[PDB]
Ligand binder design. Structure first.
Ligand SMILES: [Ca+2]
Ligand SMILES: [Ca+2]
Ligand SMILES: [Ca+2]
Lengths: 39, 39
């Protein structure tokens, strides 16, 4: 089944990665935004 | 704001880089150590 899309640490800047099905979400610290916390 | 300090792949020897705020961390394979898995 689907693997772990967080294994590559896609979330920058201390963001917490949650694995989804063929995708991932980043939970960013306050005041970082963007899909990977890059803003 | 803060950039991706994993730019340029600082972790050696198969290590995995995680971007933090103004810093990065490496996970290193068993048998390797140092900040950048260089020891
Ligand atoms: Ca997945
Ligand atoms: Ca390099
Ligand atoms: Ca960073």
């Amino acid at each position: 089944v689907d693997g772990d899309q967080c294994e590559s640490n896609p979330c920058l800047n201390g963001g917490s990665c949650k694995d989804d099905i063929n995708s991932y979400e980043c939970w960013c610290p306050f005041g970082f935004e963007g899909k990977n916390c890059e803003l």
